Motif scaffolding. Structure first.
Motif, PDB file in Angstrom:
ATOM      1  N   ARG A  11      94.030  52.330  49.111  1.00 45.59           N
ATOM      2  CA  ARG A  11      93.510  51.801  50.363  1.00 45.59           C
ATOM      3  C   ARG A  11      92.406  50.801  50.061  1.00 45.59           C
ATOM      4  O   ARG A  11      91.536  51.059  49.225  1.00 45.59           O
ATOM      5  N   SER A  12      92.445  49.658  50.745  1.00 42.25           N
ATOM      6  CA  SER A  12      91.463  48.602  50.549  1.00 42.25           C
ATOM      7  C   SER A  12      90.991  48.104  51.906  1.00 42.25           C
ATOM      8  O   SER A  12      91.806  47.871  52.803  1.00 42.25           O
ATOM      9  N   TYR A  13      89.678  47.945  52.051  1.00 44.37           N
ATOM     10  CA  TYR A  13      89.082  47.473  53.294  1.00 44.37           C
ATOM     11  C   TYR A  13      87.945  46.520  52.968  1.00 44.37           C
ATOM     12  O   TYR A  13      87.055  46.856  52.181  1.00 44.37           O
ATOM     13  N   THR A  14      87.978  45.333  53.571  1.00 45.00           N
ATOM     14  CA  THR A  14      86.949  44.325  53.362  1.00 45.00           C
ATOM     15  C   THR A  14      86.704  43.589  54.670  1.00 45.00           C
ATOM     16  O   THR A  14      87.648  43.093  55.291  1.00 45.00           O
ATOM     17  N   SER A  15      85.440  43.522  55.082  1.00 42.57           N
ATOM     18  CA  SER A  15      85.056  42.847  56.312  1.00 42.57           C
ATOM     19  C   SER A  15      83.832  41.983  56.052  1.00 42.57           C
ATOM     20  O   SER A  15      82.912  42.397  55.340  1.00 42.57           O
ATOM     21  N   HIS A  16      83.828  40.785  56.630  1.00 40.73           N
ATOM     22  CA  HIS A  16      82.732  39.840  56.474  1.00 40.73           C
ATOM     23  C   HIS A  16      82.342  39.299  57.841  1.00 40.73           C
ATOM     24  O   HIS A  16      83.210  38.916  58.631  1.00 40.73           O
ATOM     25  N   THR A  17      81.040  39.270  58.114  1.00 39.84           N
ATOM     26  CA  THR A  17      80.522  38.776  59.382  1.00 39.84           C
ATOM     27  C   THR A  17      79.265  37.963  59.120  1.00 39.84           C
ATOM     28  O   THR A  17      78.331  38.450  58.475  1.00 39.84           O
ATOM     29  N   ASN A  18      79.244  36.729  59.621  1.00 43.26           N
ATOM     30  CA  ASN A  18      78.106  35.840  59.444  1.00 43.26           C
ATOM     31  C   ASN A  18      77.919  34.994  60.693  1.00 43.26           C
ATOM     32  O   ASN A  18      78.894  34.594  61.337  1.00 43.26           O
ATOM     33  N   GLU A  19      76.660  34.732  61.035  1.00 42.53           N
ATOM     34  CA  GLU A  19      76.317  33.925  62.196  1.00 42.53           C
ATOM     35  C   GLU A  19      75.221  32.942  61.820  1.00 42.53           C
ATOM     36  O   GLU A  19      74.275  33.295  61.110  1.00 42.53           O
ATOM     37  N   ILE A  20      75.353  31.708  62.301  1.00 47.79           N
ATOM     38  CA  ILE A  20      74.388  30.645  62.044  1.00 47.79           C
ATOM     39  C   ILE A  20      74.017  30.012  63.377  1.00 47.79           C
ATOM     40  O   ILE A  20      74.899  29.679  64.176  1.00 47.79           O
ATOM     41  N   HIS A  21      72.718  29.855  63.619  1.00 46.87           N
ATOM     42  CA  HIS A  21      72.234  29.284  64.866  1.00 46.87           C
ATOM     43  C   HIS A  21      71.014  28.420  64.581  1.00 46.87           C
ATOM     44  O   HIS A  21      70.342  28.576  63.559  1.00 46.87           O
ATOM     45  N   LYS A  22      70.745  27.488  65.491  1.00 45.71           N
ATOM     46  CA  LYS A  22      69.523  26.690  65.425  1.00 45.71           C
ATOM     47  C   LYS A  22      69.274  26.071  66.792  1.00 45.71           C
ATOM     48  O   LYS A  22      70.157  25.404  67.342  1.00 45.71           O
TER      49      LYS A  22
END
Lengths: 45, 48
Positions: free
Chosen positions: B17-28
């Motif tokens: 079993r493999s699980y990978t999650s990525h979350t990124n936010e950029i604001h200005k």
């Protein structure tokens, strides 16, 4: 194994966990104000 | 995890079993304003 019979049992288990999180902070701000009074119209330059 | 046992019968099991999650936010957000006020001379005046 002893006369007469044979038994074999094998068990294998491994786990791996890795987590990485990175956050960076940078901001700049600056204000500049000014006032003046000066007593021909060429001086308005 | 994988387990294999033989006791007059062959048995094999495999699970992955493999699980990978990525979350990124950029604001200005920037707000800037400049107010100026002048007052010319026009030497004449109303002392009439």
């Amino acid at each position: 194994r002893v006369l007469f019979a044979k038994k074999t049992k094998v068990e294998h288990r491994c786990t791996t966990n890795k987590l990485s999180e990175k956050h960076e902070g940078s901001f700049i701000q600056g204000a500049e104000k000014s006032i003046s009074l000066i007593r021909s119209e060429y001086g308005a330059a | 995890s994988s387990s294999r046992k033989r006791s007059f019968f062959r048995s094999s099991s495999s699970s992955s079993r493999s699980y990978t999650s990525h979350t990124n936010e950029i604001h200005k957000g920037k707000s800037y304003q400049l107010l100026v006020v002048e007052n010319t001379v026009e030497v004449a005046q109303f002392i009439n």
